[PDB]
Amino acid sequence: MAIPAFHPGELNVYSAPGDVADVSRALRLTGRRVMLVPTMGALHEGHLALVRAAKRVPGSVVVVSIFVNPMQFGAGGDLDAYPRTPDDDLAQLRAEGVEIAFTPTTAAMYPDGLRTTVQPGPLAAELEGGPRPTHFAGVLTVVLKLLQIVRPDRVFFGEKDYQQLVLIRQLVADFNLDVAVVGVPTVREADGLAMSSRNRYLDPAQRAAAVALSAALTAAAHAATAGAQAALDAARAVLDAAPGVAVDYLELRDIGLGPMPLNGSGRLLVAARLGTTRLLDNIAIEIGTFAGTDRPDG
Amino acid sequence: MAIPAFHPGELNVYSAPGDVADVSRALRLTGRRVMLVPTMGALHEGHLALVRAAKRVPGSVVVVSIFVNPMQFTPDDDLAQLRAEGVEIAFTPTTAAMYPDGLRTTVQPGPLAAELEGGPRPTHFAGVLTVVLKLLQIVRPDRVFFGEKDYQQLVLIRQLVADFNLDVAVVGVPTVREADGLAMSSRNRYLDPAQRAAAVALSAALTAAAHAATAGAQAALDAARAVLDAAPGVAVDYLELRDIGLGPMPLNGSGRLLVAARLGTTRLLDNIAIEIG
Ligand SMILES: COc1ccc2c(c1)cc(C(=O)OCc1cc3ccccc3o1)n2CC(=O)O
Ligand SMILES: COc1ccc2c(c1)cc(C(=O)OCc1cc3ccccc3o1)n2CC(=O)O
């Protein structure tokens, strides 16, 4: 009762929040499980893995949102006119059998400018948040809004942007949101580079050196049998051997981004600049007496 | 795993957020409309009026949450009143249940929160909006009911709902008043009989202003000031005429006149609808 056109088995594209909210609600009433994949477009194989994870849930209908949230741009930073490929985007979604694309305007998302917003916890001031102190407020505000509009049963995020994922789990816990946050392992290029829409920014020399991030992390994960100092120093030596790579941070944390014990299990996160382009990556890691395995570590 | 225990036409009291969310989901699916009445307990005729408004919605089940929110500003007596009112659900969470991770992700209100009541208390409304978002997420009501007495708060809640695209109706219920017109409040018990007699000046100023308003905005404001000037011991923090969303009052039209004042140590608030000329 009030439903926009909806063609099942087809990609249906809605800009109006109200429209996708009424479609999502009707679909929920028929007992389909609504899955949300929030994106900023320029879709790559990583996003497709998110869509495929969502597709695997029985009864799933998949909503992919595409919205370049200005409240996570720019000055300073981040300073890029973000890649926009709306045509290819929807043709990828079609091929994958996604039924809903939500592509709102800025005016429909922010009809009152920045008025009520989400204040993230103090994790948002660390790491990615240090130099850009309101960035995560912008992520968590738009993600809360997407969740209220679409009301999915689960929402799917890549693990690459690991701080953002943790903060979104924080959001969902803290506001009692009735949604499951699904983190999906990072899709990588063949040489190990974490997929990102911003990888296309890299010139040839830079694309070649950028392999050092994933090579560092992988080297660290295997060095870690010998402890956290070995893991870190192995990662930093790889990073230092790559020309044109400038390290922002290289840090060990627990899975929730608290302190890492030595001899435990956690995450190693890295951010670096190549010319003007910032890259992130992270890996699961186990250190010391926690890194023993049947065979060779780890 | 079973839907938790719900006994229709009795008062069902849940302390676990999970419990209430489950029960409310179940009923929304068995064809009830879920109504939420958020309270801090110490219930009075004012809250019962919120209760009665909710009850009247056909097919309603009424959820009355009772939570004293540390981030903001008598158990078995409250539950008595609700049972007597035919309230089917009371939600009575603990602080640890509401805040297991302490103060982490919170709501940041827009600039309205730094004004009027937010001048004395600049983080009051952040706590209010945060708990209200949480209660709305836990109960998912069709409609949420608030008194108009805390009008700035009501307006902020409507900002929350619009801004976070919450799909709930916010229902403001006209302020219940004592026979002399004093807006009902918990704080009215504080008042010695002199403060209590002097307290009538707030509602009297506002209704005099409402009626003076046929002669314009200055007439309305001057009438309210005269009435307040006639009261001893009433320290007026503000008296402001605004539009109904608490922006600038238009030239003429519909607005809201708001007052706050201190009597000894009790801070009292009131507001009224005003139609200019
Ligand atoms: C699982 O394999 C991968 C590997 C890398 C991945 C993904 C999947 C997905 C992304 C991604 O960013 O999506 C865009 C986005 C949506 C969004 C919504 C709210 C806030 C921030 C947001 O950022 N990326 C990184 C990238 O494209 O640079
Ligand atoms: C329309 O008739 C009236 C008249 C006066 C009224 C009410 C109704 C309601 C209240 C009231 O405060 O309820 C408690 C409350 C709970 C809560 C939870 C989260 C946020 C804010 C919140 O405020 N009062 C004033 C009072 O009793 O202090």
From Swiss-Prot, chain B:
Its EC number is 6.3.2.1. InterPro entries: Pantoate_ligase, Pantoate_ligase_C, Rossmann-like_a/b/a_fold. The gene is panC. It comes from Mycobacterium tuberculosis (strain ATCC 25618 / H37Rv). Subcutaneous immunization with the double panD and panC bacterial disruption mutant protects mice for over a year against subsequent virulent M.tuberculosis (strain Erdman) infections; mice show mild lung inflammation and fibrosis despite a chronic bacterila infection. This is a promising attenuated vaccine strain. It is an enzyme of class 6 (ligase). Its main location: cytoplasm. The keyword Ribosomal protein does not apply. The modification N-acetylthreonine is found at residue 2. Keywords: Acetylation, ATP-binding, Cytoplasm, Ligase, Magnesium, Metal-binding, Nucleotide-binding, Pantothenate biosynthesis, Virulence. It is found in: Cytoplasm. This is Pantothenate synthetase. Beta-alanine binds at residue 72. Changing residue 149 to A: More than 1000-fold reduction in activity and 50-fold decrease in the affinity for ATP.
